[PDB]
Design a protein around this ligand. Structure first.
Ligand code: MG
Ligand code: MG
Ligand code: MG
Ligand code: MG
Ligand code: MG
Ligand code: MG
Ligand code: MG
Ligand code: MG
Ligand code: MG
Ligand code: MG
Ligand code: MG
Ligand code: MG
Ligand code: MG
Ligand code: MG
Ligand code: MG
Ligand code: MG
Ligand code: MG
Ligand code: MG
Ligand code: MG
Ligand code: MG
Ligand code: MG
Ligand code: MG
Ligand code: MG
Ligand code: MG
Lengths: 149, 77
RNA sequence: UAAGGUGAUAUGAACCGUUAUAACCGGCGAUUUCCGAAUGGGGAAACCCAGUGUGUUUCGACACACUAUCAUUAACUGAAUCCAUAGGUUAAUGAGGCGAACCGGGGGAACUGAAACAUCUAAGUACCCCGAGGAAAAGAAAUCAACCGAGAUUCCCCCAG
RNA sequence: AGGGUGACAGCCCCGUACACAAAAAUGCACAUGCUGUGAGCUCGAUGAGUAGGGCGGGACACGUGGUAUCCUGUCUGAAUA
RNA sequence: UUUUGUAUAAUGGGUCAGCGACUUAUAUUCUGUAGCAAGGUUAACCGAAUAGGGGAGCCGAAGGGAAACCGAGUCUUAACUGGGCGUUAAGUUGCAGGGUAUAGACCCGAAACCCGGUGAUCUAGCCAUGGGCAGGUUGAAGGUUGGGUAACACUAACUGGAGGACCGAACCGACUAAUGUUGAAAAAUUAGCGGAUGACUUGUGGCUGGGGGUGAAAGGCCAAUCAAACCGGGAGAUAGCU
RNA sequence: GUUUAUUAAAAACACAGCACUGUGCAAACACGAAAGUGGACGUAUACGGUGUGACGCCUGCCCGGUGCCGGAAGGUUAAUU
RNA sequence: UGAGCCUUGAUGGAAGUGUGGACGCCAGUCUGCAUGGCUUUAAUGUUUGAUGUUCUAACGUUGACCCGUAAUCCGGGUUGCGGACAGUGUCUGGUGGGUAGUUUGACUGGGGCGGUCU
RNA sequence: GCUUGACUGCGAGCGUGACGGCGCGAGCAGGUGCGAAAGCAGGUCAUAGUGAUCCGGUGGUUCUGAAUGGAAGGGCCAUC
């Protein structure tokens, strides 16, 4: 009695691993109570077609927008800015929708504040490339041109 | 009728055989048990009179198939 | 088919016939009480007692038909549980019981032989049980052979006491 | 061939050899129809709680023997031209 | 007939007539006989059917050795002066007979073992439901009332109606004697005898089945029978016995 | 009171009473390969087995033997591995 | 809890003001505990058997209830109790006149006893 | 005193038994001991001191070996 799993399952469980358990546990508890299945071989591909049409399928289907920053590898036009101040230095901060004002007409239009650098956000020159939240992995690159008026 | 509903296993005859080799008619009869099985294809408990081995057979072929026999052989279940 | 007939003990009576409906013989039908698988219920076989349909210049009641169980199928119903299954009624099909041997299978003795007796024998015999056919069973090699070859099963003669 | 007829019958009777016969119901063959039914070619697929094994029995002429082969009550259990 | 021996007072037969016991099959050997002869003969089958075909095969012409093997020799042994078994005699197939083997095997006969059935209409026990016990005795508990006690105790009449109680018919039994014993009767008759309101007795129906029942227990009873019923079968059990 | 129906009616069996011993209830025990059932519509003041056999006065010694009961050490010890 | 492997501490960013355990060659120094400009050792993660607690979900229920159902059966369902026990199948040791089949010699001045049997 | 003839293979020819078997035996071959030698020795003065067959054990031995080569098992000799 080997059988393969569904839900978790105490001292062996793993949503689909390859266990070998006493037949009692199974024909008395696991199946007929949906948690496992006879490894009828027919099945050890029916549930290995998954381990391939998934753990290397949809784990590849992730990669179709590399860094997402595809043809945005030469900065973005600088419509306005992000602000300045202190007659020389800096003084003003990013309102909860104010690092787009600049890159305000490129990709797609949003308005949210997924803050990444928990500092006072350094006040100096201007043009800085950190990252920003573009996904649960990759990154991007753009610059910041101030406004002289 | 001590008879395994899945394998057809009924009692057989044989001798005993002492040291002196004395035959004495006897029976071997199967390890029956009659067990409640869950189907899920039927949302019910069907309870077959089965010998172990009869059991080891469902454990493999699978209930929905074993009951597929019986039905196709006429048996009640 | 016919010039003679109405079986026998067994006459007699009253009749039927002789050129084709006398009788006799063969094919096919009709009728076929009651008991009996007996099947509407019962029961001490040939008896008792029903239910539902019908049916009458006298539509009381009394006669005629249907009504057993089980299996497959179908329709309609339909619990605990709301679905669903179980269950329930109806219908259409089929089975039932009998009977020689041979036949396949399920069980399976002992007397006796061994000059006693237990392994062994009698013997898978007697017998009980189930199933079937004109035969049954078996049967197209995971069989033999022996370095050549043979080519399913069945039966006979050898091989060989 | 045989049987009978007042004793033993080829030629008295019934038969016998031989040659014939069915309106009907059936048996078996064929030749047809009806309902089925599947045919031939190519490409596939090749019978797992099975084979095998432990234990206890039973079959094999073979009495467990050095004992192959077969069946299985119990417990186990492969390979895949 | 059996016996050392039977007139035997040891077995058997009343008598007659009819029946009544060494067979049959297959193998196997010998003898007789016939055919063919180092050869004889076919089986199944085919069939032109007692022919003919069929030579599969069997027996014989070669033995010795456990065997490999050798071979008129071979084995024994290292080898035999030698020793054992062989080479020097015809066979084979029918047919008839004498034996033997396997079969009931010359015929009749057990007590029994085993298998499947039929029997609780006799009887044992139990179950349901029904019936019976003339007549006569004894007179438990309890009650009432007196007498008695301080009160109980106690006591007397009466009342009451206990009991596997007493006597005794029916009814159930069966202790003794005689009769009977080719009976009136396959268990009785007659005179006596025990129980007789009880663990009584009895009708109808029911249940218990054979290594089983039932049994106040005798191995009793289970259809005129029981240390394992009856009927049919195994079955012509076996019979070193008569 | 019972008994050998048919050679034994007794001192035999039974008996009320006594004891031992088993049984917690799906009881022990018994019929039955089982299901089912008696025990019992009972429950230890009950049910079974065994022996003794009213009652009176009593019922002593022996556990080596056999049987039975209890025993968590060791020795020996089956299938199994 | 008996044994194996994987591991992080034992055999094969300095010195001073401060601690439990110890075969410590017989009087060490250690194994660590604070600080301060492949082979002799302990715990886990674990793999493998033994023992014990408990669980529930096989299985038991000769408790109660519901329905099939006007039913002391059965079945399904609910619930309560018990529960990997009990029970049963196969194998296996013991016991086992309850039952079964048998055996239990001959000679002999009848038989038995005694005695004898080459 | 010296020694292993209590030897191995055989055996004319007798005895004695219904049989199974038992006994006696000169002599032959090989090899051995004692004796200078002739010669003696195949247990013990002789006659009891024993157990057929089956089954199995051990050693030897290609004899056998179920397609073939092996092996198992069998045979043969010794012995339990
Ligand atoms: Mg009728
Ligand atoms: Mg009827
Ligand atoms: Mg005998
Ligand atoms: Mg056929
Ligand atoms: Mg195939
Ligand atoms: Mg005399
Ligand atoms: Mg005289
Ligand atoms: Mg005389
Ligand atoms: Mg009666
Ligand atoms: Mg009285
Ligand atoms: Mg009286
Ligand atoms: Mg009288
Ligand atoms: Mg009688
Ligand atoms: Mg008889
Ligand atoms: Mg016979
Ligand atoms: Mg006879
Ligand atoms: Mg008498
Ligand atoms: Mg008397
Ligand atoms: Mg008592
Ligand atoms: Mg007494
Ligand atoms: Mg006394
Ligand atoms: Mg006995
Ligand atoms: Mg016998
Ligand atoms: Mg004698």
């Amino acid at each position: 009695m080997q059988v393969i799993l569904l839900d978790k399952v105490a001292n062996l469980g793993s949503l689909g691993d390859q266990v070998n358990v006493k037949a009692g546990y199974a024909r008395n508890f696991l199946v007929p109570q949906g948690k496992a299945v006879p490894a009828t071989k027919k099945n050890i591909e029916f549930f290995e077609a998954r381990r391939a049409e998934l753990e290397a399928k949809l784990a590849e289907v992730l990669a179709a927008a590399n860094a997402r920053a595809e043809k945005i590898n030469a900065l973005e036009t600088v419509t306005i800015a992000s602000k300045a101040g202190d007659e020389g230095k800096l003084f003003g901060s990013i309102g909860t929708r104010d690092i787009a004002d600049a890159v305000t007409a490129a990709g797609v239009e949003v308005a949210k504040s997924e803050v990444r650098l928990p500092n006072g956000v350094l006040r100096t020159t201007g043009e800085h490339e950190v990252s920003f939240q573009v996904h649960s992995e990759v990154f991007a690159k753009v610059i910041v041109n101030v406004v002289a008026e | 009728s001590r008879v395994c509903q899945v394998t057809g296993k009924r009692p057989v005859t044989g001798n005993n055989r002492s040291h002196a080799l004395n035959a004495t008619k006897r029976r071997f009869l199967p390890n029956l048990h009659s067990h409640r099985f869950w189907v899920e294809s039927e949302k019910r408990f069907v309870t077959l009179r089965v010998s172990a081995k009869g059991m080891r057979v469902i454990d493999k072929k699978g209930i929905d198939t074993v009951l597929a026999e019986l039905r196709a052989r006429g048996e009640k279940y």
